[model samples]
Target chain A: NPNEAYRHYMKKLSYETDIADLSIDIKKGYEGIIVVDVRDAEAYKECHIPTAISIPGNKINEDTTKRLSKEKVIITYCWGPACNGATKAAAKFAQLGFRVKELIGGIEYWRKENGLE
Target chain B: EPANPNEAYRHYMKKLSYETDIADLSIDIKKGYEGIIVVDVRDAEAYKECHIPTAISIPGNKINEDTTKRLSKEKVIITYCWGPACNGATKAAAKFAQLGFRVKELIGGIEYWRKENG
Candidate 1:
């Protein structure tokens, strides 16, 4: 059980990400990462992380999928822990063969971490 | 005019009825209390990595008609995910409620649960 749990956690770290890591990469202006706000366009229009693109979970379809780069890791997020849009979009991205990770806290924690809370 | 204080109080009380906190939940786990079921609504990898002991893995995306097979209408379902930033629990809670189960979202989720109890 311990071994199984260990592996599970290790794999979890690989599949999810935090805002701290995202913030660092954004500060560096890393090109290998693509931040995506998976919330609706209205929410994205109101506020979003810098450098993040708007792509609602329901809108992540064939045409929209073409706008992304397969070479980059897609970090998806929605409204804080109370919404699953990020996970939904992440699934869509992964199904399309793009490397993706759900941003654990979404924009809610991001703002809180940055003192906007 | 200012909003009615009674209405505001009622709103929050109703909201609290549908939620639980890590501190209170930790006590329940310690006492091995019954009448409550913890549901993990994150992805499989996240559930595998770590979860509240006794919690069942039921990722939000996977909730369907068959979800009711493993759950009961008698006990309250306590749904949770990663933390304040994740809403996998909320989505799962909605599904469970739709199936006629009394469900509550665990505030702060596993992130706070582990930090306080682990």
Candidate 2:
């Protein structure tokens, strides 16, 4: 049972990234990862993960999809734990066969953590 | 004019009608409430690890006409996924609503349930 639990958590980790880890990665200028703000453009204009690009969940389409690369992993975020914008965006990316992960806690937690940029 | 407080009140009241936290859910479980049924919308592996007591695994994405036949229309469905950050439960609740089952989402999900109850 623990083994199955282990695999389950592993799968979860494979699909998600947290604010603190992402903060550290951003500080280090980590490459091969594209952080995406899945909230609307106005929300993104207010604040976002450093170096993240805006692609609102509802606006994700072939045109917007072309802006990303298959070679890089996409890290998506939205409002916070209470919002599903990132999930929607991640699902879209997944459907398009791109490697992606949702940023758990989103900008709400990011702000709580005092993450800069 | 200032914003309407009544609108905020209505928003929260409506939200409460469709969502519950682990605190209340745990109490309902302890009370042996029969009106609600807990459903886990995470994948089988996650469900196998640990879930709310009496929860049935339905994995959110798997819900459809074929899979929903066993669910009772008589009971209010309470769906949960990994945590607040995950929307598997929300999606499942939507599907449950569309299928004519009264549904509520367990906010904070199993993670909060485990943290608070365990």
Best by lDDT: 2
- Model 2 per-residue lDDT tens digits across residues B1-118: 6458999887677668777888888999898999899999988998898778988889887888788898788998899987655667666777787777878888788778878965
- Least lDDT summed over 10 consecutive residues: which range in candidate 2 chain B? B82-91
In model 2, the runs with Cα more than 4 Å from the true position are A1-104, A107-117
lDDT digits (tens) for residues A1-117 of candidate 1: 223323433455578887667888988999998998888888888888998888889988879879778999999998877888888889999999999999987887899766321
Output per-candidate TM-scores for chain A, rounded to 2 decimals.
Answer: 0.92, 0.94
Per-residue error (Å), model 2, residue A55 = 13
lDDT of 1 by residue, B1-118 (tens): 6569999898687667767898888889889988899989988898898789988888887887787687777888889988765656665676777666777779788878878875
The lowest-lDDT stretch of 10 consecutive residues in candidate 2 chain A is: A1-10
Q: What tier of docking accuracy does candidate 2 attain?
A: incorrect
**Model 1 spans > 4 angstroms off:** A1-48, A51-108, A111-117
Model 1 interface Cα RMSD in Å: 11.7
Task: Report the poorest 10 consecutive residues by lDDT, candidate 1 chain A.
Answer: A1-10
RMSD of each: 12.7, 11.2
Return the number of clashes found in candidate 2. 1
